[PDB]
Design an enzyme around this catalytic site. Structure first.
Site, PDB file in Angstrom:
ATOM      1  N   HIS A  89      48.482  54.100  34.668  1.00 58.44           N
ATOM      2  CA  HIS A  89      48.917  52.587  34.351  1.00 58.44           C
ATOM      3  C   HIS A  89      49.385  51.953  32.885  1.00 58.44           C
ATOM      4  O   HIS A  89      50.438  51.596  32.514  1.00 58.44           O
ATOM      5  CB  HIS A  89      47.953  51.521  35.219  1.00 58.44           C
ATOM      6  CG  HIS A  89      48.533  50.354  35.252  1.00 58.44           C
ATOM      7  ND1 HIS A  89      49.293  49.746  36.463  1.00 58.44           N
ATOM      8  CD2 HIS A  89      48.244  49.143  34.731  1.00 58.44           C
ATOM      9  CE1 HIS A  89      49.869  48.574  36.364  1.00 58.44           C
ATOM     10  NE2 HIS A  89      49.287  48.200  34.968  1.00 58.44           N
ATOM     11  N   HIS A 102      53.336  45.782  41.607  1.00 56.52           N
ATOM     12  CA  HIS A 102      51.865  45.292  41.711  1.00 56.52           C
ATOM     13  C   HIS A 102      51.385  45.928  43.164  1.00 56.52           C
ATOM     14  O   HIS A 102      50.820  45.290  43.955  1.00 56.52           O
ATOM     15  CB  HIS A 102      51.827  43.970  41.752  1.00 56.52           C
ATOM     16  CG  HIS A 102      50.708  43.336  40.741  1.00 56.52           C
ATOM     17  ND1 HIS A 102      49.947  42.384  41.209  1.00 56.52           N
ATOM     18  CD2 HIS A 102      50.604  43.584  39.380  1.00 56.52           C
ATOM     19  CE1 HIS A 102      48.688  42.199  40.138  1.00 56.52           C
ATOM     20  NE2 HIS A 102      49.296  42.731  38.999  1.00 56.52           N
TER      21      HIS A 102
END
Ligand SMILES: [Cl-]
Length: 586
Positions: A31, A71
């Site tokens: 990430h 997301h």
């Protein structure tokens, strides 16, 4: 990660401390660190000449700051909070570039309309005062346990007031301001965004900018203080000393590592000169926010973390900022395969959102239901935003499916009379260790379509490891294309004849000829739809807003085609095939 821990250990030449274990587990996560994509990203043609990523010159006076972000992982766990918080994060991202966030475009991919997702976006968007200008919404059972939430945000910024995303010189300081820092970031990975605080964060940041106080900036998201401060100075080849005892707190008995890594929402990092700092805090306070001077920018490229006089951590800053890099695979494209039709349903964004008292595209030159969001900046100046993907094709052939998605984003931009300026992209992929070639195929298709089209990458996001019990999601590159257009030249729908212009199948060597045909016809004021399905319910329902009825006989079209619908008084004269198919009347 055992491999990464061994690298960390070699680099430090000793066992990592408790805090370094926490720090690197964040920064070197996929990430944050991008280990599988960094090399692929370096092979993308990017917007050089722009001194920060995401910001693209429009007319020499204004730039557009834009970026898309995923997301996915929070949204699978808590659809409502995951989606709302997603919106809040990308708004802060655009803000940090110095722009009033003014447009949101959603790209949602789900097995079903997940009420919490649509509502989380609607409620948050309504509360911050930032309009949704469009949405791409795709429904497929292949997305059942991994809904994709990609949110693109945009805003306009004066070329004489751009904000840098780096520190710039030793002796600058870094202010953290906005919401207080709590213990934030399974349900432990969900944060609760609040739009009212972020709304104040926007006004306060823009006020700071106007006063000449912001010398650099970065939003806090994943990694919190650590991410924002290490990256600001890492980008400027500098160091930082971070004083954690200065972060304004929401829960007082937090451990230093918890302050460093908290992902509390609505926070902003501002690089400034130490003499401007008390005015910055003056403004944050006025706007009912918390703020303090937190770090010192230094010349030695070390990242030194303090709590009072206690050393929390010290490492080379470029060790945090550069995760180990996984080798790429060289991808070689074969011939375009034949495609099957895979069941992907499109939902009307304006219909879906209307149920959560949420408008889509209200302050646009033409409705986004026709394919692109067109925004007026001045009388003869504006821009366009298109979000597009073809996971239904990338399923069967990842390269060609992905490449076509980009080419079709160009078609859509040209279709409103806009010239493509740049791409922001969201890579949504499964597990790259299991399937390296799929990731390679996506990244190379983006590289080659940018090359073929002449359109550079400005910004982007990669979300990897989207799987359920090792079944990967369809490889979904969301393409968000920025275009330039004079709103005075944008075609509205009129009573007219309808023509299918182009070919019912695909050959790469004729795409540019279609583009030339669209451009020509657009210049003459023709109204043009460019869609996979040729005409949709969304198109039909949008025509009804204009009181217009379409009666057509649609040509049979392949899953990948080179056709558009052109609405004009008379037959298009172009070096591409033309067939008259019906009428638009009333
Ligand atoms: Cl690690």
């Amino acid at each position: 990660k055992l491999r990464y821990l061994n690298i960390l250990k070699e680099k430090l030449g000793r066992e990592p401390t408790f805090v370094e274990l926490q720090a690197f587990s964040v920064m070197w996560s996929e990430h944050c660190g991008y280990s599988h994509t960094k090399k692929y990203i370096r092979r993308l043609p990017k917007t050089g000449f722009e001194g920060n990523a995401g910001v693209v010159n429009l007319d020499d006076y204004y730039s557009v700051a834009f970026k898309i972000e995923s997301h996915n992982h929070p949204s699978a766990i808590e659809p409502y909070n995951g989606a709302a918080t997603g919106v809040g994060g990308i708004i802060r991202d655009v803000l940090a570039m110095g722009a009033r966030p003014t447009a949101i475009f959603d790209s949602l991919h789900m097995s079903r309309i997940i009420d919490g997702i649509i509502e989380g976006i609607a409620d948050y968007g309504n509360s911050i005062g930032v309009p949704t200008v469009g949405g791409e919404l795709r429904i497929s059972s292949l997305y059942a346990h991994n809904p994709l939430v990609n949110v693109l945000a945009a805003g306009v910024v004066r070329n004489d007031m751009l904000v840098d995303s780096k520190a710039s010189r030793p002796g600058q300081v870094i202010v953290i301001f906005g919401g207080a820092t709590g213990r934030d970031g399974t349900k432990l990975s969900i944060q609760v965004g609040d739009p009212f605080a972020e709304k104040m964060l926007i006004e306060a940041f823009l006020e700071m900018v106007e006063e000449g106080l912001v010398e650099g900036a970065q939003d806090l998201g994943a990694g919190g203080v650590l991410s924002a401060t290490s990256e600001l100075v890492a980008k400027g080849n500098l160091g930082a000393i971070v004083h954690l005892d200065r972060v304004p707190l929401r829960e007082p008995d937090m451990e230093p590592w918890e302050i460093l890594i908290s992902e509390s929402q609505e926070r902003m990092a501002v690089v400034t000169s130490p003499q401007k700092a008390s005015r910055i805090l003056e403004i944050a306070r006025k706007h009912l926010l918390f703020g303090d001077v937190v770090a010192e920018v230094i010349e030695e490229p070390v990242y030194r973390v303090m709590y009072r006089n206690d050393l929390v951590m010290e490492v080379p800053v470029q060790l945090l900022a550069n995760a180990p890099e996984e080798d790429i695979v060289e991808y070689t494209p074969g011939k375009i395969p034949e495609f099957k039709r895979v069941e992907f349903e499109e939902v009307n964004a304006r219909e879906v959102f209307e149920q959560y008292d949420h408008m889509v595209g209200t302050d646009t030159v033409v409705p986004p239901g026709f394919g692109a969001a067109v925004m007026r900046i001045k009388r003869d100046g504006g821009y366009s935003l298109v979000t597009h993907s073809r996971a239904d094709l990338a399923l069967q052939d990842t390269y060609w499916g992905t490449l076509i998605a980009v080419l079709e984003s160009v078609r859509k931009t040209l279709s409103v009379g806009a010239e493509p300026l740049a791409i922001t992209n969201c890579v949504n992929y499964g597990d790259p260790d299991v399937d390296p070639v799929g990731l390679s195929a996506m990244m190379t298709a983006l590289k080659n379509a940018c090359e073929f089209s002449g359109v550079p990458v400005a910004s982007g996001n990669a979300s990897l490891y989207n799987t359920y019990q090792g079944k990967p999601i369809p490889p979904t590159l969301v393409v968000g294309m920025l275009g330039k257009v004079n709103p005075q030249k944008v075609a509205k729908p009129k009573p007219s004849k309808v023509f299918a212009v182009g070919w019912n199948d695909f050959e790469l060597e004729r795409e540019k000829e279609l583009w030339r045909a669209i451009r020509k016809l657009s210049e003459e004021g023709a109204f043009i739809l460019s869609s996979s399905q040729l005409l949709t319910r969304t198109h039909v329902e949008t025509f009804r807003e204009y009181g217009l009825k379409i009666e057509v006989k649609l040509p049979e079209v392949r899953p990948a085609h080179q056709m558009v619908l052109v609405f004009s008084e008379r037959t298009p004269v172009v070096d591409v095939p033309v067939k008259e198919i019906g009428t638009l009347s009333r």
